Design an enzyme around this catalytic site. Structure first.
Site, PDB file in Angstrom:
ATOM      1  N   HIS A 117       0.825  -1.200   0.000  1.00  0.00           N
ATOM      2  CA  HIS A 117       0.000   0.000   0.000  1.00  0.00           C
ATOM      3  C   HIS A 117       0.859   1.250   0.000  1.00  0.00           C
ATOM      4  O   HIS A 117       1.892   1.289   0.664  1.00  0.00           O
ATOM      5  CB  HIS A 117      -0.911  -0.006   1.223  1.00  0.00           C
ATOM      6  CG  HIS A 117      -1.955   1.068   1.218  1.00  0.00           C
ATOM      7  ND1 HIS A 117      -2.736   1.343   0.117  1.00  0.00           N
ATOM      8  CD2 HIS A 117      -2.379   1.899   2.199  1.00  0.00           C
ATOM      9  CE1 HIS A 117      -3.582   2.315   0.416  1.00  0.00           C
ATOM     10  NE2 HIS A 117      -3.382   2.670   1.671  1.00  0.00           N
ATOM     11  N   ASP A 134      -4.785   8.250   3.331  1.00  0.00           N
ATOM     12  CA  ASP A 134      -4.876   6.797   3.196  1.00  0.00           C
ATOM     13  C   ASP A 134      -6.125   6.497   2.386  1.00  0.00           C
ATOM     14  O   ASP A 134      -7.247   6.715   2.861  1.00  0.00           O
ATOM     15  CB  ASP A 134      -4.948   6.127   4.569  1.00  0.00           C
ATOM     16  CG  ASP A 134      -5.021   4.599   4.491  1.00  0.00           C
ATOM     17  OD1 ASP A 134      -5.070   4.035   3.376  1.00  0.00           O
ATOM     18  OD2 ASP A 134      -5.049   3.966   5.570  1.00  0.00           O
ATOM     19  N   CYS A 187      -3.831   2.397  -5.343  1.00  0.00           N
ATOM     20  CA  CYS A 187      -3.448   3.319  -4.272  1.00  0.00           C
ATOM     21  C   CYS A 187      -2.438   4.380  -4.712  1.00  0.00           C
ATOM     22  O   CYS A 187      -2.550   5.538  -4.306  1.00  0.00           O
ATOM     23  CB  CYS A 187      -2.900   2.561  -3.061  1.00  0.00           C
ATOM     24  SG  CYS A 187      -1.594   1.404  -3.363  1.00  0.00           S
TER      25      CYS A 187
END
Length: 243
Positions: A117, A134, A187
């Protein structure tokens, strides 16, 4: 069912940052490998701010130095920069920086994203704001926990890089819900999209304006990715923009 969004690794993110710098010269296009991690992102930021201070005093750099940038060009960037885009590579399994780097290496060899991530930490020097993005909302930890961590860090930055008016660094946890809903490898692109929105308008909550539908949301991101990949096609290879 998943909209096609390319996985962006450290190399494409860096290219995007170089492109963003040309649009917003206050953004310093920090290299993405070796990446920041949850274990060292704070110390990495402090080292960069210390080097900016040194440049402003006409003193030598302490480092670490860029791989794709000449010494002089790096000094030009530090003199000018108002905004640090810090990309943090994270995986739930590794428990140290060394093991994190090993896991990243193994996954790169495999051409796989796995459970890895990208997080974004924006250090806005000019506005004195720390922004944590995030796309998975609470993948590393609950947002209230990261808020506390970053409030402590903000106090440290006030001492490392003080303002004459003694203005204190503020903290923002940007995502209020899971953004990357129904997507497994978007991401990196999400971080760059958020960064671009912030550069255009650091007040407007662009995340709130996203479609509720997961696919439409990621098809919009795919449009952004397509626009970026075209823009970075002819950028010099492994080389910072000239400041």
């Amino acid at each position: 069912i998943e909209a096609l969004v390319p996985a962006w690794d450290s190399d494409i993110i860096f290219k995007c940052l170089c492109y963003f710098h040309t649009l917003y010269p206050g953004l310093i296009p920090l290299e993405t490998f070796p990446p920041a991690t949850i274990f060292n992102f704070k110390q990495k930021i402090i080292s960069i701010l210390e080097d900016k201070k040194a440049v402003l005093r006409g003193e030598p750099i302490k480092g670490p130095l860029p791989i794709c940038c000449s010494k002089e060009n790096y000094r030009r960037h530090l003199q000018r920069t108002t905004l640090l885009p810090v990309f943090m590579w994270y995986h739930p399994t590794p428990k140290t920086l060394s093991d994190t780097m090993q896991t990243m290496k193994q996954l790169a060899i495999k051409g796989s994203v796995g459970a890895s991530h990208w997080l974004l930490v924006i250090v806005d020097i000019q506005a004195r704001r720390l922004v944590y993005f995030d796309s998975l909302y609470n993948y590393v930890m609950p947002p209230e926990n990261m808020k506390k961590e970053l409030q402590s860090f903000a106090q440290q930055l006030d001492q490392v890089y003080p303002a004459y008016d003694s203005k204190k660094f503020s903290v923002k946890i940007a995502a209020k819900e899971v953004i990357q809903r129904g997507s497994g490898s978007s991401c990196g692109a999400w971080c760059c999209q958020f960064l671009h929105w912030y550069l255009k308008d650091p007040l407007t909550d662009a995340l709130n304006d996203l479609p509720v539908d997961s696919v439409e949301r990621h098809e919009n991101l795919a449009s952004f990715v397509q626009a970026c990949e075209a823009a970075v096609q002819d950028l010099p290879e492994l080389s910072w923009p000239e400041a």
